[PDB]
């Protein structure tokens, strides 16, 4: 009815969309095997938005999978899911990037990508009308990278008015995995801020953190990690699937963000995410706990309000909720502090209720925000491609792939761009 | 002493305990004919942004 | 899906494969006095000849 | 009424808890594991 | 679908490839018949002998290895060993005569006959494979065979080839112990045609293996069985991400992307961390973080070189076992906050970290335990610009007083390879000093 | 997480090392394999699977004493790694203990204490002990101090120290290992306090029937002394304070630092069937100065700090009224400035009790520590007879052909004098 084509990039990005389709086929009520198991009539009457009828009174979803590698496509056909997939919308290459951008650019991925957008057309012409894809990708190496820009940039062309969302994974220093991470993410910024309609910022040094310190787990693998934190944040888009007193879709929700056409990066968030034993002793109202989160510690992404300005936040919520008490609480929450708020916006915040929560919660709740402390990540990782780059470190695996030293000091200053435009709006 | 790299026999108390080997059996069958690839004719149905058949009756 | 999302099951299983490997090990440990003993009188044969 | 519906709403809840611990005693008390997983002639 | 051929040169090649491929044969079913063992088997179901392996119709598998030698009595040893039945007959190319210890015997007139024949038969085996990422050379630097004959490939190789990532392990010769006396000659003349046409290059000196095993295990007289099988355990941890499924699998291309700064500074060290007598491997823990800091020290690298001098350019770490991704990010916590441990002023990240499910085996009578964590750690130091220096003072009494010449100078080989050569390594040995200088 | 690390150097402190690690191996009960039949997590570390390991030196520059240990009983109970053995005997040279021989085995020493490190997260204290009478207690534990504390800084290292009795010893050209020692200690330690212990002879006979001992039925009561000092940390009290509590609290100047008390009821089976032991008569019986372990008297000395250790069936009514009746009698003279003089941890857990020693089983025990001006007169008398060998320059040739100056031997002795004008005045 407003559909969504899902697209995975990346090895990050088959770890995720093998999360991101058990969450929501959870709520839809969907066995692996593909046929329809629920009890209520309103998860079946909005199917038509990430899914596809088969024969037989089947459900596939529509994802467009990639990698260069086909050790990682193996994996997704062999787990909990996954044989809902259809079979053609697999598409891998035969050797890797050698986790590297401009071989994942120009010369190594580039056979792919003829293959990749003719899958993407078959899942466009069976639509009524589509609000708009979606991307989930990794900026730390070249299938996720630099196949996640060559994309975005080969879609947003051909199909301009529907909207784009991204999840990039950026870079972090104290947990850093590659030595090419602040070499791939500062030019691949540039090819990211010119055709991404929204964008999000999710790091792994914050999902470390908030692993051992709020939910208390002792082992945080990677499964455990990427499903109870960020395969579930995408399920932001239940005003979409299901009805409510006052929704916003996904579009609305752009419209009240994003003040300036080149200011879109935000940091999300989850409300309940207490742990196994402290679940038992909280209060499942609408408090300020984890809703004045501005003491930061239960935030997904790595700079926090102190030391900026929120330009304009979101709150999406989930159940059976009273209107009185989402608003009175966005009146302790813009007062009792007062300065981390943009002056000339006396009203930032952008709300909404839906009315099915996620399974075996009462009360769930999803924080969005934007703000200009933003600005020190992309400082911060423009410092390690500014020294890397004056010695000319890891250099001659970019030139003499097509890719020349001009296009390295022009993702510098429009890297550079953004700390400015930022900057401005830091108090005016 | 080159008689030392083969004489032994392997007992089974001296094995790994688990084994994760790489399966290609789904791999394969993709990787022996090309992927999907448009040589069609294109059918899109008329798509309209808001107004799917509408009646205009009372119109004169 | 519940095996792989359980945490528990990954903190027993490292328990099973620990106490495996230290029995292994006690296994090569008998492996190994066997080959002494083996250079040992491998030795005294040599004494005998010399003799 | 809304009352009741909150009390037995909680009690579904602390059942389907104790159902889940019994599930993971279950599981880590009894063990299985597939063949084709076992190193190639430690199998018999 | 990932194939990876294995060519051995000289009797380095063959005795570290008959270590080498007792290890291969032991972590799948290949008993030395070839044929897996028949346990009713309804399955199978095993696709991770492809990489070191080609299935047969019938049961067996045969290697892809190409043993060469010029020197006929090791390769008959092979030929006449309990792996007779294993390898294909052909594949044993051996000689018709010695090169005894001479870079222009092993490299112009006695190595260029036998080479007709091999080049043929790498062909053979490289069609077969379908998607081939890169071959590994084994070989030495003391005799003929093995400075000379490997110089004729790597010139051969490389126009032959091209895009395929090479890779060697080399035994460099001691700066204090030694076998020979005419080896200096042939470890200077052997850098000029490697500098150029070898990918990325692995090196190992006879002193660290020969002191390490004296000192962490409680052993005492080694031989080449136990140097080989420590030097096996490393050939099968780097490739290991391709055999097995892991949580991040770095293949064979990925290293010399976050290993080699500039493509004349391609000579990594290489270390094992849980290597560990059984005796004594159940008297310690060998957690995540024993095994990283214990692998940092300067007593255990490799090379006779001291770490402590240069410092460090890029690092690559390999774990393998049952390691969470989690603590390989908390004992890099330990390592940086140190002073002793000085990374270089242009590279702030500075590691790449792998993991990798399946924990190593043993080999019945051998001398390293089995585990459950273990990790290769492949650094790129400095400090390997003094392992160079301590050999060129080594070249200069020979050469400027003129001995040993007399017989380089008949074979086929004028005198104006010395000279050049010489100053050959004096541009690379220049090139190490300028990047350590930090640049403000 | 609240590790501690202990030596046991010198022949003296392997006859220790029997006794402070018999009453460790049965505070908790410890297998000879290291699986029981978190308390314990101060000394050992869980391994992979089941094994634990003490962190525990044993640290001779002979190996004869250490494949002693090795013949011992508790073979794989102590881990061979940490325990440090020498080639060459140093043989009381400190030019052969600290230059030529110990730098080859140094980086070995440090590898091993950086590996173990890790584990070392939350240490509260690395307790060392040593002999001053040979290159197996003084050179190679300086030179550890020095190398330990320009490698960390911060890190707890303590010491208490084992001294030379003037009428008896071993070696008798000791004391300018003696003087040496008293100079490097100052530096690179948070402290150094009393093992020095002569008069464990006065107190193994006088109270306890076993004359004719070893240093063995001394060094029971030496690691009984060990035992009440960091058994508040090992345990939970009433009042437990640990050992980086303890550093904060005990030294007033930080140059000047080394008291003298015992443990007290050292008492056995045969005064133990008769005397009703209470908290006030054990610390009555142990105020008398006769029964000390430090050989000085501060009964006509200056009572100046103190600290107190209480084991068992301790009551805080017991430990008060006590102190107010021995506070009472200036049959103990009291100090100038200092009005109280008493300071107290509690434990819960009455002290274990190992066979083949000289005591007895306890309800509950006292202890007591009193830092004066004593040890003034002790190192008064050991200026008295230093300088004897010093005017006519013996075995000084054996020092110097190895690497070492007379230099040294010219500053360490002024150094000392140097710490006696800072004790003469308080
Ligand atoms: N690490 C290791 N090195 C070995 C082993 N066997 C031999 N070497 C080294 O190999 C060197 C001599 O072997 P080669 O160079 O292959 O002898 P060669 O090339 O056949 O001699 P030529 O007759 O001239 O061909 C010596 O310096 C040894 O140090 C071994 O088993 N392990
Ligand atoms: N008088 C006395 N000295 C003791 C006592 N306990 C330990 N000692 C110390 O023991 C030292 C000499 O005896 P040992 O410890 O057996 O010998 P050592 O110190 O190891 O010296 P070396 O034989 O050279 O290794 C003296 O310097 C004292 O410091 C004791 O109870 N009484
Ligand atoms: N969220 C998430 N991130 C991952 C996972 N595995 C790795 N990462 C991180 O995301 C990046 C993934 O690298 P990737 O681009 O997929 O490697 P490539 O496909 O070979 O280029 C790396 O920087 C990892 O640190 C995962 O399972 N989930
Ligand atoms: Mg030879
Ligand atoms: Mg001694």
């Known amino acids: 009815m407003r559909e969504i084509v899902h697209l995975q990039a990346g090895q990050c990005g088959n770890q995720i969309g093998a999360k991101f389709w058990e969450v929501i086929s959870d709520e839809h009520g969907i066995d692996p095997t593909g046929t329809y198991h629920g009890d209520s009539d309103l998860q079946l009457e909005r199917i038509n938005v990430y899914y596809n009828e088969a024969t037989g009174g089947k459900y596939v979803p529509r994802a467009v999978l990639v990698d260069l590698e086909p050790g990682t496509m193996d994996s997704v056909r062999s787990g909990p899911f996954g044989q809902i997939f259809r079979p053609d919308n697999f598409v891998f290459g035969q050797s890797g990037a050698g986790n590297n951008w401009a071989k994942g650019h120009y010369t190594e991925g580039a056979e792919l990508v003829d293959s990749v957008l003719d899958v993407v057309r078959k899942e466009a012409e069976s639509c009524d009308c589509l609000q708009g894809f979606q991307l989930t990708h990794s900026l730390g190496g070249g299938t996720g990278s630099g196949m996640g820009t060559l994309l975005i940039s080969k879609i947003r062309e051909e199909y301009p008015d529907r909207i784009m969302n991204t999840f990039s994974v950026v870079p972090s220093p104290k947990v850093s995995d590659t030595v090419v991470e602040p070499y791939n993410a500062t030019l691949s910024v540039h090819q990211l801020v010119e055709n991404t309609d929204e964008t999000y910022c999710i790091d792994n040094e914050a999902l470390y953190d908030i692993c051992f310190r709020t939910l208390k787990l002792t082992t945080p693998t990677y499964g455990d990690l990427n499903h109870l934190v960020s395969a579930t944040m995408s399920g932001v888009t239940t005003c979409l699937r299901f009805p409510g007193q006052l929704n916003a879709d996904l579009r609305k929700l752009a419209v009240n963000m994003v003040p300036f056409p080149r200011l879109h990066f935000f940091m999300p968030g989850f409300a309940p995410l207490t742990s196994r034993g402290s679940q038992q002793y909280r209060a499942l109202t609408v408090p300020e706990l984890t809703q004045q989160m501005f003491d930061a510690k239960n935030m997904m992404a790595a700079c926090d309000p102190r030391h900026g300005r929120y330009l304009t936040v979101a709150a999406v919520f989930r159940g059976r909720m009273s209107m009185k008490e989402v608003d009175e609480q966005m009146l302790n929450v813009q007062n009792k502090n007062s300065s981390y708020f943009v002056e000339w916006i006396p009203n930032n915040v952008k709300t909404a209720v839906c009315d099915i929560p996620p399974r075996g919660l009462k009360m769930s709740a999803t924080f969005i925000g934007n703000s200009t402390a933003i600005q020190e990540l992309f400082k911060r990782i423009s410092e390690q491609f500014t020294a890397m780059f004056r010695r000319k470190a890891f250099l001659h695996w970019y030139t003499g792939e097509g890719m020349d030293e001009m296009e390295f000091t022009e993702a510098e200053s429009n890297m550079n761009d953004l700390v400015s435009e930022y900057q401005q709006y830091q108090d005016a | 002493n080159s008689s030392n790299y083969g004489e032994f026999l392997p007992m089974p108390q001296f094995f790994p305990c688990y084994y994760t080997p790489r399966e290609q059996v789904f791999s394969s069958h993709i990787r022996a004919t090309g992927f999907y690839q448009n040589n069609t004719l294109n059918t899109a149905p008329d798509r309209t942004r808001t107004l799917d058949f509408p009646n205009f009756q009372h119109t004169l | 899906q519940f095996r792989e999302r359980c945490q528990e099951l990954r903190a027993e299983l490292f328990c099973i494969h620990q106490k495996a490997v230290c029995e292994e090990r006690k296994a090569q440990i008998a492996f190994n006095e066997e080959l002494k003993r083996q250079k040992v009188v491998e030795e005294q044969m040599f004494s005998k000849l010399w003799e | 009424a809304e009352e009741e519906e909150e009390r037995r709403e909680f009690e579904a809840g602390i059942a389907a808890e104790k159902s889940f611990q019994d599930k993971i005693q279950g599981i880590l008390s009894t063990h299985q594991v597939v063949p084709r997983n076992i190193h190639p002639m430690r199998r018999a | 679908m990932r194939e990876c051929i294995s060519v051995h040169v000289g009797q380095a090649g063959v005795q570290i490839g008959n270590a080498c491929w007792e290890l291969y044969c032991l972590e799948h079913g290949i008993q030395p018949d070839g044929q897996m063992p028949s346990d009713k088997t309804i399955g199978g179901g095993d696709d991770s002998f492809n990489t070191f392996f080609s299935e047969t119709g019938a049961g067996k598998h045969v290697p892809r290895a190409v043993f060469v030698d010029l020197e006929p009595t090791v390769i008959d040893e092979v030929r006449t060993g309990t792996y007779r039945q294993l390898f294909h007959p052909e594949q044993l190319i051996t000689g018709k005569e010695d090169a005894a210890n001479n870079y222009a015997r092993g490299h112009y007139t006695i190595g260029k006959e036998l080479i007709d024949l091999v080049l043929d038969r790498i062909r053979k085996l490289a069609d077969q494979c379908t998607g081939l990422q890169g071959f590994l050379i ?153 095994i990283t800091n214990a692998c940092f020290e300067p007593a255990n690298q490799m090379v006779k070189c001291d770490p402590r001098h240069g410092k460090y350019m890029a690092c690559c770490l390999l774990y393998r076992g049952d390691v969470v991704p989690k603590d390989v990010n908390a004992a890099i916590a330990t390592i940086k906050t140190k002073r002793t441990i000085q990374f270089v002023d242009w590279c702030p990240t500075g590691f790449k970290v792998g993991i990798n499910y399946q924990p190593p085996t043993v080999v019945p009578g051998g001398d390293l335990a089995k585990v459950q964590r273990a990790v290769c750690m492949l650094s790129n130091t400095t400090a390997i610009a003094e392992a160079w220096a301590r050999l060129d003072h080594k070249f200069d009494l020979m050469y400027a007083k003129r001995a040993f010449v007399h017989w380089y100078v008949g074979e086929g080989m004028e005198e104006g390879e010395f000279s050049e050569a010489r100053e050959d390594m004096a541009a690379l040995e220049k090139d190490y000093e300028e990047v350590g200088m930090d640049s403000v």
Do not use: W
Request: proline share 5%; net charge negative; hydrophobic share 35%.
């Open chain 5, 138 to 290: 084994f070989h030495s630097f003391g005799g003929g065979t093995g400075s000379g004959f490997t110089s004729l490939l790597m010139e051969r190789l490389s126009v032959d080839y091209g895009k395929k990532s090479k890779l060697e392990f080399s035994i460099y010769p001691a700066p204090q112990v030694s076998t020979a006396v005419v080896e200096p000659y042939n470890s200077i003349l052997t850098t000029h045609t490697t500098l150029e046409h070898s990918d990325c290059a692995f090196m190992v000196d006879n002193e660290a293996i020969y002191d390490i095993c004296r000192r962490n295990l409680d052993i005492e007289r080694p031989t080449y069985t136990n140097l080989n099988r420590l030097i096996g355990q490393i050939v099968s941890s780097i490739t290991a991400s391709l055999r097995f499924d892991g949580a991040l699998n770095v293949d064979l291309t990925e290293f010399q992307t976050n290993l080699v700064p500039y493509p004349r500074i391609h000579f990594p060290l290489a270390t094992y961390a849980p290597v560990i007598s059984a005796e004594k491997a159940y008297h310690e823990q060998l957690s995540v973080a024993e």
